[PDB]
RNA sequence: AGGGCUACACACGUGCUACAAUGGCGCAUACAAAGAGAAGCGACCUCGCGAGAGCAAGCGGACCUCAUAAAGUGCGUCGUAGUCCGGAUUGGAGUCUGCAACUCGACUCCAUGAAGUCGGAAUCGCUAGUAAUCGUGGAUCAGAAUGCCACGGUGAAUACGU
RNA sequence: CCUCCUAAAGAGUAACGGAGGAGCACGAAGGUUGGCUAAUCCUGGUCGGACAUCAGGAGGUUAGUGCAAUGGCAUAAGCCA
């Protein structure tokens, strides 16, 4: 994990979008490619559409998700089993 | 003998015997005994009731046994309930820490299941 | 009770770590040393998350 | 007899005040306590039925009655009359003394004891509970245990409802979560 | 830009680590060779259990640094147990590189403590400083070896014969 | 040879009429004295599950009877000593 002294990494464009969306009522999802950003407390209640490689998966942010990276909630591989 | 709700081996050295508690390894065993003023090569049988009580008092400082078990179960349930990558890996009984699954992964997957 | 058939059943002393001492009939024969009892067990007395943590580790 | 004097002197008063009973004879009583082991794995080994009956004897202070199959049951491979359990009925002095050993000694020794279910009343006032390991009773020697036996304990009460039964049990500081 | 090359009912090849007592653990203490280094190697000191961090010498080097070799030896302990064997897996907490460690890094600490008790048919290497075993260094490289390339230490058995 | 129906409310009553059983078992499964009461389901309860043993309730013989069927059987003929 990222060193504690560096703090939590979030992409600047996503931080700006989240500040804008918290400041003006809950809008449509936040379309983002920043799977690598940390989920901040000020995203709770927002719906964030995280790219998985092909699509933007909706992620409703709850408190239990805080501190995780957004890509943790948008699986990138499709697998339903072999011999199926 | 009876510490943290469990019986500790009576014939082993105290260091080894305390690692029978769920949540006590070798380092925590040394720490407990050095905080209770008891030599590590002392067999549990060669211990006064009062010294066993001191040992019990020092074990209650660490989360062990059923408290530790439900902590771990809560952490895994939280992962599974969130639906994060690690939660899905726990659900499907696959390695959670990035290991290859093309081969190996038998510890998580269990015995080979032929087609 | 019938004669001759039952376990020997006599009074002994149960001494707990917390200074509780109770005399009790039992089949154990000897005296007991209790590591816990009803007067010191934490359930009987009453001696029984992400946002907090994120904000404490990432003090800006 | 400690808990029987506690019942006669404190429990009756508490319950009479709470439920506004006219006669003390209405206060619920602990009528009996039955300890039962189902040892269905003794159809293979009869010697497993005895050793369980040894534990019960140690735990209750009372030779147990071997129970047997009311009817043949092909799912469990039991013919009618086959001995597949043991039980003790504790009454009076022995009942109150086992009740004290259970509340004050044995239940504190249950692994990860977080309380007993206040749900386990039969609808008529009687309380059943299970014990997963017979080791919680200090009569059962750990260095002498052959197999991890459990048992069930029923407390049959004269209470008319579950409300009254749980008021009676909680008057003895029964550890209901 | 984001994802994939890291998928996972499964099968094979090449390895690593074991299954222990010719061993494990603890303390103490001997004896190498080779090699690399400037956006690099980084001492000493201080802090941290630790990975590390802070400060900061020396060295383009038979000078400084990486950098105590380990097996060994002495003392003590474990006493044949799935164990004081094994160290997979997972939870929690961290460090560092790097715009960035979710997919998918290495490492640390606490906890956890799986299979495995010498491996079916079959099959491989090796004739001497070899095999076996023990550590060490380098290229690639921000970071990322159980692989590759190289270096010493200990050091066998057997070869009648075709 | 036994039980039921045909068989017409006493007995009896035929057909290559309609359905089943017997050719034993038991020194207790006989005698007697003392006691006892079922099936089934609901709720609670370690393993334990549809179904074992335990507790309570409902039910009231819908059980049981050494073996068919019928008629009996609680004062039990049923179950224990
Ligand atoms: Mg450890
Ligand atoms: Mg990898
Ligand atoms: Mg690209
Ligand atoms: Mg590849
Ligand atoms: Mg080890
Ligand atoms: Mg050089
Ligand atoms: Mg095994
Ligand atoms: Mg072995
Ligand atoms: Mg040759
Ligand atoms: Mg090597
Ligand atoms: Mg290099
Ligand atoms: Mg490198
Ligand atoms: Mg007639
Ligand atoms: Mg007529
Ligand atoms: Mg005629
Ligand atoms: Mg009679
Ligand atoms: Mg008769
Ligand atoms: Zn106590």
XYZ file of C-alpha atoms (C1' of nucleotides) and ligand atoms in Angstrom:
697
model
C 0.000 0.000 0.000
C 0.945 3.654 -0.510
C 3.171 4.940 2.302
C 1.218 6.687 5.058
C 3.511 9.757 4.832
C 2.463 10.323 1.228
C -1.230 10.195 2.160
C -4.044 8.779 0.003
C -3.750 9.027 -3.789
C -6.724 10.385 -5.745
C -6.686 11.674 -9.322
C -7.104 15.461 -9.392
C -9.826 15.424 -12.057
C -11.893 12.995 -9.943
C -11.403 15.105 -6.793
C -12.677 18.126 -8.753
C -15.691 16.194 -10.096
C -16.609 14.933 -6.613
C -16.342 18.411 -5.081
C -18.545 19.783 -7.876
C -21.120 16.991 -7.431
C -21.316 17.284 -3.628
C -21.741 21.071 -3.977
C -24.820 20.862 -6.230
C -27.041 17.921 -5.228
C -26.599 14.309 -6.366
C -26.218 14.314 -10.167
C -26.045 11.295 -12.569
C -23.081 8.941 -11.916
C -19.524 10.265 -12.121
C -18.062 8.729 -15.283
C -14.408 7.996 -14.474
C -11.437 5.946 -15.655
C -9.530 6.471 -12.383
C -9.711 2.960 -10.952
C -6.517 3.852 -9.031
C -8.126 6.612 -6.938
C -8.851 6.079 -3.261
C -12.512 6.316 -2.248
C -12.796 9.361 0.029
C -15.469 9.934 2.704
C -16.895 12.834 0.701
C -17.952 10.399 -2.043
C -20.406 8.503 0.219
C -23.851 8.576 -1.366
C -22.474 9.369 -4.825
C -22.803 6.910 -7.698
C -19.492 6.577 -9.571
C -19.278 4.818 -12.947
C -15.811 3.201 -12.945
C -14.314 1.952 -16.219
C -13.470 -1.809 -16.224
C -11.788 -1.884 -19.685
C -14.988 -1.821 -21.820
C -17.805 -0.318 -19.717
C -18.434 2.034 -16.820
C -19.743 -0.059 -13.908
C -21.965 1.870 -11.435
C -20.617 1.877 -7.868
C -22.847 3.390 -5.172
C -20.313 4.562 -2.583
C -21.081 3.597 1.022
C -19.052 4.223 4.174
C -17.681 0.663 4.188
C -15.968 1.410 0.842
C -13.889 4.330 2.182
C -10.143 3.805 1.847
C -10.519 1.266 -0.977
C -9.503 1.942 -4.584
C -12.419 2.435 -7.030
C -11.253 -0.392 -9.390
C -11.827 -2.783 -6.491
C -15.539 -2.548 -7.387
C -15.327 -2.954 -11.201
C -14.066 -6.441 -12.145
C -12.054 -6.441 -15.368
C -12.282 -10.139 -16.322
C -15.408 -12.070 -17.318
C -15.559 -15.635 -16.011
C -18.617 -17.850 -15.579
C -16.884 -21.222 -15.378
C -15.382 -23.845 -17.674
C -17.304 -27.033 -18.747
C -20.376 -24.755 -18.760
C -3.510 -25.756 32.404
C -6.686 -23.700 31.647
C -5.973 -20.267 30.034
C -8.170 -18.308 27.544
C -10.872 -21.001 27.915
C -8.566 -23.746 26.661
C -6.190 -26.339 28.121
C -2.445 -25.648 27.522
C -0.067 -28.651 27.160
C 1.205 -29.352 30.713
C 4.456 -31.134 29.739
C 5.871 -28.554 27.277
C 7.953 -25.454 27.962
C 5.758 -22.407 28.661
C 6.714 -20.651 25.383
C 5.582 -23.593 23.257
C 2.544 -24.262 25.453
C 1.156 -20.713 25.162
C 1.207 -20.939 21.355
C -1.668 -23.428 21.741
C -3.897 -20.374 22.275
C -5.488 -19.141 19.032
C -3.824 -15.782 18.571
C -0.551 -16.466 20.400
C 2.544 -17.210 18.336
C 6.153 -17.382 19.443
C 6.657 -13.600 19.684
C 3.474 -13.031 21.718
C 4.408 -16.056 23.838
C 7.771 -14.499 24.728
C 6.071 -11.137 25.370
C 3.454 -12.671 27.706
C 6.026 -14.614 29.747
C 8.450 -11.680 30.013
C 5.545 -9.496 31.194
C 4.716 -12.153 33.816
C 8.293 -12.732 35.024
C 8.399 -16.434 34.067
C 11.227 -18.293 32.343
C 10.460 -19.700 28.898
C 11.829 -23.208 29.612
C 9.503 -23.660 32.630
C 7.080 -26.513 32.019
C 3.460 -25.587 32.733
C 3.232 -28.320 35.385
C 6.143 -26.720 37.278
C 4.083 -23.544 37.780
C 2.259 -22.258 40.843
C -1.457 -21.515 40.628
C -0.563 -17.849 41.171
C 1.862 -17.867 38.239
C -0.840 -19.413 36.036
C -3.103 -16.540 37.162
C -0.471 -13.972 36.139
C -0.213 -15.725 32.756
C -4.009 -15.527 32.444
C -3.874 -11.796 33.233
C -1.272 -11.197 30.514
C -3.211 -13.230 27.911
C -6.311 -11.056 28.503
C -4.340 -8.107 27.064
C -4.381 -9.770 23.600
C -7.500 -10.621 21.523
C -7.391 -14.432 21.331
C -9.646 -17.502 20.934
C -13.281 -16.717 20.037
C -12.900 -12.924 20.064
C -10.103 -13.224 17.441
C -12.113 -15.788 15.435
C -15.163 -13.548 15.184
C -12.952 -10.544 14.360
C -11.468 -12.460 11.417
C -14.886 -13.752 10.335
C -16.218 -10.175 10.462
C -13.350 -8.896 8.296
C -13.943 -11.604 5.688
C -17.734 -11.115 5.769
C -17.247 -7.410 5.272
C -15.078 -8.116 2.223
C -17.598 -10.638 0.780
C -20.602 -8.309 1.468
C -18.909 -5.280 -0.215
C -18.401 -7.156 -3.457
C -14.852 -5.857 -3.844
C -12.305 -7.952 -5.750
C -11.058 -9.592 -2.539
C -14.622 -10.363 -1.470
C -15.329 -12.099 -4.775
C -12.097 -14.097 -4.433
C -13.179 -15.208 -0.950
C -16.592 -16.223 -2.338
C -15.203 -18.336 -5.181
C -12.488 -19.976 -3.038
C -9.658 -18.631 -5.207
C -6.367 -16.970 -4.177
C -6.925 -13.454 -2.853
C -3.366 -12.063 -3.055
C -2.677 -12.127 -6.796
C -1.278 -15.655 -7.073
C -1.407 -17.518 -10.365
C -4.472 -19.688 -10.875
C -3.471 -21.272 -14.256
C -1.570 -23.847 -12.126
C -1.081 -24.387 -8.338
C -3.653 -22.548 -6.126
C -4.434 -26.007 -4.598
C -4.456 -24.628 -1.045
C -7.442 -22.415 -1.901
C -9.067 -24.627 -4.547
C -8.601 -27.887 -2.614
C -7.841 -31.344 -4.186
C -7.657 -31.629 -8.058
C -11.253 -31.821 -9.495
C -11.085 -33.803 -12.836
C -13.372 -32.859 -15.829
C -32.650 -42.305 45.843
C -31.826 -45.995 45.611
C -28.897 -47.343 47.604
C -25.598 -48.574 46.177
C -26.106 -47.479 42.544
C -25.311 -43.768 42.331
C -22.015 -41.866 42.104
C -20.411 -40.770 45.341
C -21.669 -37.231 45.791
C -20.184 -35.020 48.504
C -19.425 -31.409 49.376
C -16.259 -29.763 48.017
C -14.972 -26.187 47.621
C -14.746 -24.317 44.305
C -12.163 -21.531 44.573
C -12.126 -19.020 41.725
C -9.356 -16.587 40.801
C -11.529 -13.562 41.684
C -11.723 -14.452 45.391
C -15.128 -16.110 44.982
C -15.337 -19.345 47.014
C -18.408 -21.606 46.864
C -19.048 -24.876 48.701
C -20.980 -27.275 46.457
C -21.898 -30.941 46.324
C -20.323 -32.687 43.344
C -18.913 -36.042 42.186
C -15.378 -34.772 41.512
C -14.006 -35.791 44.929
C -11.178 -33.268 45.282
C -11.423 -29.472 45.504
C -11.748 -27.303 42.417
C -9.662 -24.410 41.103
C -11.771 -22.232 38.801
C -10.164 -19.899 36.271
C -13.586 -18.261 35.771
C -16.937 -18.151 37.546
C -20.338 -16.462 37.405
C -19.081 -13.463 39.424
C -16.010 -12.613 37.301
C -16.856 -13.841 33.784
C -17.203 -10.718 31.597
C -20.636 -11.626 30.209
C -22.146 -11.840 33.703
C -20.690 -8.506 34.845
C -21.011 -6.664 31.527
C -17.417 -6.310 30.308
C -18.665 -7.610 26.947
C -15.415 2.297 11.127
C -13.884 3.071 7.746
C -14.431 6.843 7.945
C -12.899 7.115 11.434
C -9.870 5.145 10.254
C -9.392 6.971 6.947
C -9.593 10.361 8.664
C -7.201 9.352 11.454
C -4.543 7.912 9.118
C -4.838 10.771 6.582
C -4.787 13.861 8.780
C -4.374 16.721 6.302
C -30.021 -25.823 48.580
C -28.601 -22.328 48.149
C -30.769 -21.570 45.124
C -33.879 -23.134 46.625
C -33.617 -20.746 49.595
C -32.924 -17.909 47.157
C -36.125 -18.933 45.344
C -38.191 -19.125 48.539
C -36.909 -15.780 49.857
C -36.226 -13.468 46.891
C -37.610 -14.935 43.657
C -41.157 -15.395 44.989
C -41.292 -11.771 46.181
C -39.962 -10.363 42.894
C -42.396 -12.402 40.796
C -45.373 -11.704 43.087
C -44.702 -7.972 42.796
C -44.175 -8.110 39.025
C -47.115 -10.262 37.909
C -49.528 -9.180 40.691
C -50.279 -12.749 41.736
C -52.923 -13.268 44.403
C -51.497 -16.527 45.815
C -47.853 -17.508 46.163
C -48.993 -20.865 44.734
C -49.296 -19.033 41.399
C -45.590 -18.111 41.309
C -43.856 -20.496 38.852
C -41.684 -23.255 40.299
C -38.764 -25.177 38.885
C -40.371 -28.628 38.784
C -37.519 -30.710 37.342
C -34.358 -30.683 35.246
C -33.817 -33.454 32.687
C -30.386 -34.093 31.173
C -30.398 -36.131 27.961
C -27.719 -37.547 25.680
C -28.666 -38.884 22.270
C -25.969 -41.492 21.573
C -27.359 -42.770 18.259
C -23.778 -43.652 17.313
C -24.026 -46.469 19.880
C -25.828 -48.832 17.492
C -22.337 -49.610 16.179
C -20.630 -49.603 19.599
C -22.591 -50.349 22.764
C -19.413 -49.431 24.700
C -19.934 -45.831 23.507
C -23.364 -45.813 25.182
C -21.889 -46.732 28.573
C -19.111 -44.119 28.550
C -21.648 -41.390 27.726
C -23.776 -42.730 30.598
C -20.613 -42.376 32.692
C -20.348 -38.644 31.854
C -24.011 -38.079 32.710
C -23.487 -39.865 36.041
C -20.506 -37.605 36.773
C -22.373 -34.472 35.700
C -25.688 -35.107 37.475
C -24.541 -37.150 40.473
C -27.196 -39.699 39.522
C -27.179 -43.013 37.655
C -28.819 -42.336 34.255
C -31.740 -44.174 32.678
C -30.811 -45.715 29.313
C -33.488 -44.741 26.800
C -34.362 -46.841 23.775
C -36.066 -46.515 20.422
C -39.836 -45.992 20.607
C -40.125 -47.378 17.057
C -37.943 -48.716 14.256
C -36.490 -45.953 12.058
C -34.777 -47.175 8.877
C -33.178 -43.795 8.115
C -31.070 -44.039 11.295
C -30.711 -47.857 11.228
C -32.506 -48.292 14.572
C -34.846 -51.106 15.485
C -37.604 -50.629 18.216
C -36.087 -51.257 21.640
C -32.510 -50.422 20.759
C -30.767 -48.300 23.445
C -29.749 -45.007 21.840
C -29.730 -42.473 24.671
C -29.480 -41.789 28.372
C -31.224 -39.328 30.666
C -31.446 -38.181 34.275
C -34.399 -36.530 35.985
C -33.160 -34.230 38.762
C -35.729 -33.125 41.337
C -35.606 -31.366 44.682
C -32.221 -30.970 46.346
C -30.206 -32.563 43.513
C -32.022 -30.369 40.981
C -31.205 -27.160 42.871
C -27.575 -28.206 43.342
C -27.100 -29.002 39.640
C -28.845 -25.720 38.779
C -26.282 -23.889 40.925
C -23.321 -25.799 39.434
C -24.666 -24.942 35.972
C -25.348 -21.222 36.521
C -22.268 -20.454 38.585
C -19.587 -22.863 37.301
C -20.390 -24.702 34.072
C -21.925 -21.945 31.915
C -18.953 -19.573 32.558
C -16.765 -22.338 31.060
C -18.613 -22.484 27.720
C -16.180 -21.598 24.920
C -16.862 -18.017 23.786
C -19.970 -17.749 25.960
C -21.959 -14.743 24.762
C -25.221 -15.522 26.548
C -28.026 -18.073 26.392
C -30.941 -17.705 23.999
C -34.086 -16.301 25.580
C -35.848 -17.837 22.549
C -35.513 -21.459 23.690
C -38.755 -21.687 25.668
C -41.203 -24.360 24.497
C -44.203 -22.011 24.336
C -45.457 -23.317 27.700
C -42.754 -21.995 30.065
C -40.028 -24.690 29.908
C -36.446 -24.001 28.882
C -34.219 -26.296 26.849
C -30.567 -25.659 26.030
C -27.724 -27.627 24.471
C -24.172 -28.218 25.681
C -21.681 -28.911 22.905
C -18.776 -30.218 25.019
C -19.176 -32.055 28.324
C -15.851 -30.493 29.453
C -17.523 -27.331 30.799
C -18.426 -29.463 33.852
C -15.293 -29.796 36.044
C -16.469 -33.280 37.068
C -15.499 -34.365 33.540
C -11.707 -34.629 33.646
C -9.985 -33.215 30.563
C -7.072 -35.690 30.738
C -9.720 -38.466 30.928
C -12.029 -37.480 28.045
C -12.538 -40.238 25.458
C -14.850 -38.481 22.971
C -16.305 -34.964 22.783
C -19.881 -35.673 23.977
C -22.572 -33.051 24.273
C -25.990 -33.127 25.963
C -29.235 -31.225 26.290
C -30.674 -29.771 29.487
C -34.390 -29.121 29.961
C -35.731 -27.057 32.870
C -39.390 -27.936 33.324
C -41.318 -25.210 35.138
C -44.893 -24.754 36.359
C -45.149 -21.385 34.548
C -48.156 -20.899 32.298
C -46.447 -18.830 29.557
C -42.978 -18.100 28.185
C -43.135 -14.636 29.795
C -43.499 -16.229 33.243
C -40.861 -18.890 32.571
C -38.244 -16.362 31.545
C -39.122 -14.103 34.478
C -38.521 -17.104 36.758
C -35.193 -18.010 35.146
C -33.974 -14.390 35.081
C -34.817 -14.100 38.786
C -31.908 -16.532 39.300
C -29.677 -14.316 37.112
C -29.790 -16.894 34.327
C -27.483 -15.466 31.601
C -29.978 -14.534 28.876
C -28.425 -12.486 26.066
C -6.996 6.782 -21.320
C -8.718 2.277 -19.167
C -8.289 -3.127 -19.583
C -5.512 -7.527 -21.169
C -0.718 -10.314 -21.821
C -1.281 -12.246 -14.382
C -7.934 -15.469 -16.555
C -8.757 -21.206 -14.372
C -13.070 -27.621 -14.158
C -8.091 -29.180 -15.972
C -3.061 -31.755 -18.337
C 2.344 -31.636 -19.084
C 7.597 -29.670 -18.707
C 11.443 -27.068 -15.702
C 12.392 -25.617 -10.781
C 12.047 -24.045 -5.435
C 10.662 -25.676 -0.420
C 9.719 -29.781 2.430
C 8.262 -34.196 4.763
C 12.810 -33.595 9.812
C 17.101 -35.614 14.968
C 23.446 -36.424 9.670
C 17.586 -32.265 12.206
C 14.671 -27.507 14.289
C 15.327 -23.457 17.632
C 18.573 -20.152 20.952
C 23.285 -18.063 22.324
C 28.433 -17.747 20.995
C 32.165 -17.968 17.489
C 35.893 -19.526 12.792
C 37.471 -19.915 7.519
C 36.142 -17.595 0.962
C 36.257 -16.438 -4.011
C 34.301 -13.567 -7.622
C 31.910 -8.993 -8.859
C 29.348 -4.048 -9.110
C 29.136 1.150 -8.228
C 27.979 8.394 -9.980
C 20.203 10.320 -11.436
C 25.404 5.095 -8.552
C 27.412 2.200 -4.163
C 26.227 4.540 0.266
C 29.619 4.033 5.781
C 29.263 6.172 10.801
C 25.637 8.115 14.113
C 20.296 8.678 15.596
C 15.269 6.816 15.460
C 11.985 2.258 14.401
C 10.563 -4.727 16.860
C 11.256 -4.680 11.568
C 10.972 -3.522 6.291
C 13.070 1.169 6.671
C 13.842 6.455 7.862
C 16.682 11.066 9.182
C 21.359 13.103 8.889
C 25.574 12.451 6.492
C 31.644 10.433 5.369
C 34.261 7.973 1.687
C 34.619 6.101 -3.245
C 34.696 6.423 -10.720
C 37.717 2.627 -6.422
C 43.952 -3.495 -4.512
C 42.071 2.944 -0.847
C 35.347 3.983 0.033
C 30.728 1.209 -0.252
C 27.613 -2.832 -1.287
C 29.502 -6.550 2.710
C 29.077 -10.756 9.406
C 29.622 -15.834 3.865
C 26.836 -20.051 4.968
C 27.339 -24.821 5.716
C 31.107 -25.420 10.205
C 32.461 -25.461 15.569
C 31.171 -25.049 21.114
C 27.262 -24.763 24.680
C 21.880 -25.460 25.724
C 17.135 -27.292 24.347
C 13.398 -30.057 21.660
C 12.707 -36.348 22.052
C 10.015 -38.864 17.140
C 5.046 -35.938 17.568
C 1.997 -33.808 11.869
C 5.990 -32.228 16.406
C 9.711 -26.494 18.903
C 9.002 -30.749 11.511
C 6.830 -28.030 7.206
C 5.518 -22.769 5.948
C 1.244 -22.958 1.994
C -3.066 -19.888 2.858
C -5.727 -15.983 4.958
C -6.850 -11.608 8.422
C -4.845 -7.197 10.558
C -0.942 -3.435 10.552
C 3.085 -1.229 7.738
C 7.620 0.125 4.465
C 9.817 1.342 -0.166
C 10.092 2.258 -5.501
C 7.100 4.685 -8.578
C 2.661 10.281 -11.639
C 0.133 5.452 -9.981
C 1.004 -0.893 -6.396
C -7.596 -2.356 -7.357
C -7.037 -5.656 -11.397
C -1.179 -6.883 -10.722
C 5.044 -5.327 -7.008
C 8.734 -6.511 -3.535
C 9.601 -6.488 1.458
C 8.400 -6.086 7.054
C 5.671 -7.089 11.753
C 1.591 -9.553 14.609
C -1.671 -13.452 13.979
C -2.998 -17.948 11.121
C -0.398 -22.613 10.632
C -2.623 -26.253 4.601
C -0.712 -30.311 2.009
C 3.214 -33.028 3.133
C 5.540 -38.793 7.424
C 10.066 -39.894 1.216
C 6.257 -40.250 -3.600
C 2.391 -45.725 -9.090
C 3.780 -47.100 -13.904
C 7.840 -44.682 -15.480
C 12.141 -41.467 -15.722
C 16.893 -37.814 -15.156
C 21.992 -36.082 -13.887
C 26.739 -37.275 -12.599
C 33.487 -40.771 -13.284
C 36.695 -35.971 -8.981
C 37.552 -30.972 -6.527
C 32.813 -34.269 -10.096
C 27.980 -35.522 -7.704
C 25.698 -33.798 -3.338
C 25.293 -29.823 -0.167
C 26.357 -24.467 1.519
C 26.372 -19.704 0.986
C 28.195 -15.073 -2.481
C 28.006 -11.762 -6.788
C 26.274 -9.859 -11.728
C 23.313 -8.638 -16.139
C 18.285 -7.066 -17.094
C 16.429 -3.390 -13.834
C 12.587 2.983 -10.880
C 10.701 -1.211 -8.455
C 10.036 -6.318 -9.398
C 14.308 -14.017 -9.287
C 12.914 -20.055 -6.627
C 15.154 -18.193 -13.570
C 19.784 -17.134 -16.126
C 25.082 -16.123 -15.926
C 29.191 -16.396 -12.638
C 32.041 -17.318 -7.648
C 34.132 -19.731 -3.928
C 33.275 -23.368 0.935
C 32.571 -28.564 2.478
C 33.153 -32.735 -0.249
C 31.668 -38.365 -1.492
C 30.334 -43.498 -3.767
C 31.532 -46.566 -7.677
C 33.442 -48.510 -12.456
C 34.644 -56.121 -11.999
C 33.594 -55.637 -17.036
C 31.022 -55.142 -22.573
C -58.237 -76.200 6.719
C -59.154 -70.499 8.259
C -61.383 -65.118 7.410
C -64.647 -61.733 4.602
C -68.516 -61.017 0.685
C -72.170 -63.488 -2.491
C -76.048 -65.175 1.835
C -82.202 -62.291 0.870
C -81.138 -58.520 9.581
C -81.748 -66.543 13.444
C -78.705 -71.186 11.386
C -77.517 -73.003 6.660
C -77.074 -72.007 1.391
C -74.102 -72.848 -5.227
C -70.927 -71.588 -9.475
C -63.868 -72.883 -13.172
C -68.305 -66.206 -8.380
C -65.382 -61.724 -5.823
C -60.855 -61.129 -2.266
C -57.046 -63.015 1.235
C -54.561 -66.581 4.533
C -52.932 -71.920 7.081
C -49.983 -76.833 7.030
C -47.050 -72.746 12.714
C -44.937 -70.073 16.790
C -44.312 -69.574 22.339
C -41.243 -72.661 29.134
C -42.876 -67.698 27.747
C -45.434 -65.014 23.860
C -48.461 -69.832 29.553
C -50.379 -68.827 35.198
C -51.000 -65.066 38.751
C -50.096 -60.384 41.564
C -48.783 -55.472 41.280
C -48.528 -51.536 37.992
C -49.106 -48.890 33.054
C -51.634 -46.628 28.422
C -51.407 -45.701 22.339
C -50.902 -43.484 16.873
C -49.868 -38.898 14.852
C -48.695 -33.926 14.708
C -46.935 -28.901 16.893
C -43.169 -26.157 19.926
C -38.350 -26.056 22.474
C -33.576 -28.778 22.613
C -25.711 -30.773 21.406
C -24.052 -33.348 17.285
C -29.370 -34.616 15.101
C -30.944 -34.201 9.402
C -38.008 -35.666 6.924
C -37.506 -39.327 10.674
C -33.457 -41.511 16.801
C -33.099 -39.718 22.328
C -35.170 -35.305 25.857
C -39.227 -31.514 27.541
C -44.007 -29.618 27.012
C -48.556 -29.409 24.384
C -52.675 -31.100 21.079
C -55.072 -35.648 20.098
C -57.920 -39.716 22.064
C -56.675 -45.596 20.144
C -56.932 -42.394 13.936
C -52.329 -47.344 18.331
C -51.318 -52.240 19.744
C -52.527 -57.593 19.201
C -46.324 -63.500 17.289
C -48.664 -64.473 11.598
C -54.930 -63.366 7.040
C -59.503 -61.422 7.714
C -63.622 -60.665 10.802
C -65.593 -60.012 15.381
C -63.439 -58.331 20.003
C -60.334 -55.740 23.509
C -59.437 -49.661 28.636
C -61.923 -53.922 34.275
C -57.953 -53.780 28.667
C -57.378 -59.439 25.495
C -52.619 -53.945 24.420
C -47.399 -52.556 27.493
C -43.819 -53.477 32.168
C -42.325 -56.096 36.407
Mg 4.941 -15.316 12.622
Mg 3.047 -12.499 -9.141
Mg -1.833 2.077 -22.902
Mg 3.219 -14.522 -20.401
Mg 9.667 -24.238 12.286
Mg 35.808 -2.668 -9.704
Mg -2.439 -35.089 6.118
Mg 7.753 -37.774 11.715
Mg 33.252 -38.680 -19.381
Mg 22.602 -22.220 -5.078
Mg 23.608 -5.328 -9.764
Mg 16.758 -4.746 -10.045
Mg -77.395 -65.619 8.171
Mg -82.610 -64.482 6.405
Mg -80.542 -76.253 -0.191
Mg -53.551 -56.890 36.141
Mg -51.700 -61.871 29.415
Zn -14.479 -15.900 39.533
